[PDB]
Structures are given as structure tokens and as C-alpha cells.
Design a protein around this ligand. Structure first.
Ligand SMILES: [K+]
Lengths: 214, 218
């Protein structure tokens, strides 16, 4: 099976700049049967280039491909907002068609600290014997953030999960939601619930908290 | 226009069988290959194999030989993908794509297949109530926690879709129980909290569950 290795894995650039994606094959492939695809979050992939050099119907002039043998590259000259997405190379020379592992291309912008909010468990959920506490980090950049949960100052481990939105199409920021889940019994035996947030745009950790009852 | 219409989302337990379909139209079906492509959650694309309906010539990628059957019924321009016995790692989006000298030049929307020992369950929708600890000088954050449902997906709207500015609906997380949990939040002026009702509208089609939850400050 022909292994395709893309470079780089992630790419942060601003609109108007140039992106150059590379893809190396484990053996020589005819340039006639090489392709690049684009996939935006929640959508099917779309063909960009075939024959390494030929633009698919409706694909802008700023995208261009080249290469032969084992080395192939895709270049996007004057980056636009719609170009910011995941890219995959592909060979279809072999009967066994293979793809590179992908390159995620995201928008680079001014560092922005998250706005942090904390949510106690609802009366509805507590009645069912469980207590979920949610922490929200809103509209921040870059994507790298760190959430720590604390119950009466004890660091919580293995009882929380988080997820992060796709880069926002308007402000190019991310948001993160983290849920700490404890039983009702444990929730009502502790008082101070704190979400401690660290991020490049913060000079020191931000801690939002509430006290059960108050 | 070249169209590729795929069958609806599927949910199965391990060991069970499954057939999904891909109907091509707007081109001569028997002149082109059809490819099946797997995309596991948060992962890349993998070719599973190709079929030429006109001849029923088939080549599988070495990895999928024996695990799946690709077939086609050329008279009704439909291609199929079959498993005798599903396992958890068959959970993915499955795309069909027309294949020719231009590679994979047209793609279907994709069929979601979820495989788990968990059983279909609708969500509990809890309010994420706005308060002093969820306001940042003028701006307030509120939301809904859509908890303990299976399988994906759920959709969330606010005030029957009249509110879209500043809404963030986060990707679900898969809990240790095998049930998903999702949060959806919106940021609003804190002055509007007293003068408006905020309702999240949650639909989980797989369980036929619709829920509208008012999120009031307290
Ligand atoms: K079976």
C-alpha cells in the first residue's frame, strides 16, 4: 500500500498570505493520478486538483498543484477565508487508493483572552441523583487553553470532559465547554466549585467559582 | 448535475449486519467507478474499495478484504456497502464518490454509522442558568446541557431560530457510559435577561425526542 505523508500537520496563517502543503509518497506515482481535496467541518470532501496540476471545475486560480515521482505540493497564493480548512492529498495510481493524513489550515489573528463563565447544576438534574457543573471559555485565540476543576480546592481528575468549537467564521476565535460530573451526594458535601483557566492572553490564571446554595 | 444520494443514518450493536446505499444520477452510471470512503470521528479519509457497476469489477483496499462487501445494482443506479458483523471501530461517516481519471470528482453527503453496545436513548435537557458568575460587565452567558443521549446527532436552536447571534453549540463528548453529552450556550446583554424568555429547542431524531427548555435566571 502506497503511504502518503503530508507536511505540515497544522498551519496558522492570515488571509492574503501563501500556504504551501507538501505530500511525500512511499513509492513513485504517476502525476496523472495525483489529487488534492478540501474538507470543511461537517461537510463532505471536495476535489480541488487532479493530475497534480489540473484544477477541478470552479476551483479558483490562486490554488495550484505540482509534483512528480514521490514529491507533490499544493500552493494557495492569496489566502481567503473560505480556504481555511483541512486538506488531503491522494494517489489513485494503485488499485489501492490512499490518502495523506491531512493538513489543518486555520486563521491567525490577535491573541484574545477567553471570557470565563461557570454554571451550577440545575434543580432538574439534582433530582435525578447527578450534578453536572459547566464552565465556558468564550471567544479566545489561539486554540490552546487549559481548564482545571477544583472542588473545595482539591484538583479534580478523571471526572470532567471538554470540547472546542470550530474556528468562528466571523471573529476567528474558539470557544471551549467543560463539564465536571459528580453524584448529587458528593455535590452536596462540598461547597466551593471553581473553574481555573490558563491561556496565552492571560497574565495569571483566571478562576471563576460559585458556592453551593449562595 | 451529477448527484450522489446516500441512505439515512444507521445505529447498530456489535456483531449486527448492515447495508447502506448510494444512488447516482445525472450521469451514465455504468461508465464510472464508485468508491466507498470511511472517515472515523476526528480522523482522515480511507478508501475502502472501488466497484465498476457496468462489469461489477471490484477492488478492495487490503485492510477491508473480508470485512465488507461492495456491490451494485446498475439498473437502478445504486451502489451498496455491507458488513456481516459490525464492531465499535466501524463507527464513522461513510461517503460514496464517483471515481474516474479526475480522482474522486463527486461526493455524496455521507451516511453516519454508529456501532455501540449502548442502546438508543433520548437526552435530558437541563438549563445552564445565567447569574453573577456568568456575566462579564454587560454581557451574560446562558445555555442548555443536553445530557445522556445516544447516538449522535442532536440539533439545538434558540427561540425557535429567532436567536442566532453569539450562539455556540459545542461538539458532543462521549462519556464513559457510552452516552453522549452536548452543551449549547449563547451570550446576550445582561439587561435583556429580565425582559426576555430564552428557550433552547433540542431535537434528537434517533429517539424521536423533541424538548423545549426555558432557561430562566436563578
Ligand atoms: K452478524
Amino acid at each position: 500500500e502506497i503511504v502518503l505523508t503530508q507536511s505540515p500537520g497544522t498551519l496558522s496563517l492570515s488571509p492574503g498570505e501563501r500556504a504551501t502543503l507538501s505530500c511525500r509518497a512511499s513509492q513513485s506515482v504517476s502525476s496523472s493520478f495525483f489529487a488534492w481535496y478540501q474538507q470543511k467541518p461537517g461537510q463532505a470532501p471536495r476535489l480541488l486538483i487532479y493530475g497534480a496540476s489540473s484544477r477541478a471545475t470552479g476551483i479558483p486560480d490562486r490554488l495550484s498543484g505540482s509534483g512528480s515521482g514521490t514529491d507533490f505540493t499544493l500552493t494557495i497564493t492569496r489566502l481567503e477565508p473560505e480556504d481555511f480548512a483541512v486538506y488531503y492529498c491522494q494517489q489513485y495510481d494503485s488499485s489501492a487508493i490512499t490518502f495523506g493524513q491531512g493538513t489543518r489550515l486555520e486563521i491567525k489573528r490577535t491573541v484574545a483572552a477567553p471570557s470565563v463563565f461557570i454554571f451550577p447544576p440545575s434543580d432538574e438534574q439534582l433530582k435525578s441523583g447527578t450534578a453536572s457543573v459547566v464552565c465556558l471559555l468564550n471567544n479566545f485565540y489561539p486554540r490552546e487553553a487549559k481548564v482545571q476543576w477544583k472542588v473545595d480546592n482539591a484538583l479534580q481528575s478523571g471526572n470532567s470532559q471538554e470540547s472546542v468549537t470550530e474556528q468562528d467564521s466571523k471573529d476567528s476565535t474558539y470557544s471551549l465547554s467543560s463539564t465536571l460530573t459528580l453524584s448529587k451526594a458528593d455535590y452536596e458535601k462540598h461547597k466551593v466549585y471553581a473553574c481555573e483557566v490558563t491561556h496565552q492572553g492571560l497574565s495569571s490564571p483566571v478562576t471563576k467559582s460559585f458556592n453551593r446554595g449562595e | 448535475e451529477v448527484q450522489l444520494v446516500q441512505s439515512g443514518a444507521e445505529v447498530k450493536k456489535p456483531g449486527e449486519s448492515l447495508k447502506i446505499s448510494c444512488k447516482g444520477s445525472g450521469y451514465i452510471f455504468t461508465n464510472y467507478w464508485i468508491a466507498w470512503v470511511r472517515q472515523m470521528p476526528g480522523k482522515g479519509l480511507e478508501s475502502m474499495g472501488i466497484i465498476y457497476p457496468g462489469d461489477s469489477d471490484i477492488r478492495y483496499s487490503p485492510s477491508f478484504q473480508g470485512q465488507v462487501t461492495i456491490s451494485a445494482d446498475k439498473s437502478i443506479t445504486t451502489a451498496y456497502l455491507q458488513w456481516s458483523s459490525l464492531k465499535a471501530s466501524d463507527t464513522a461517516m461513510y461517503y460514496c464518490a464517483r471515481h474516474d481519471i479526475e480522482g474522486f470528482d463527486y461526493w455524496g453527503r455521507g451516511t453516519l454509522v454508529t456501532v455501540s453496545s449502548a442502546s438508543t436513548k433520548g437526552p435530558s435537557v437541563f438549563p445552564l442558568a445565567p447569574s453573577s458568575k456568568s456575566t462579564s460587565g454587560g454581557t451574560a452567558a446562558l445555555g442548555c446541557l443536553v445530557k445522556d443521549y445516544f447516538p449522535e446527532p442532536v440539533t439545538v436552536s434558540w427561540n425557535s431560530g429567532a436567536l442566532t447571534s453569539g450562539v455556540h453549540t459545542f461538539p458532543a463528548v462521549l462519556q464513559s457510559s457510552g452516552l453522549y453529552s452536548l452543551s449549547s450556550v449563547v451570550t446576550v446583554p445582561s439587561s435583556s435577561l429580565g425582559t426576555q424568555t430564552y428557550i433552547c429547542n433540542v431535537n434528537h431524531k434517533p429517539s424521536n425526542t423533541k424538548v423545549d427548555k426555558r432557561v430562566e435566571p436563578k
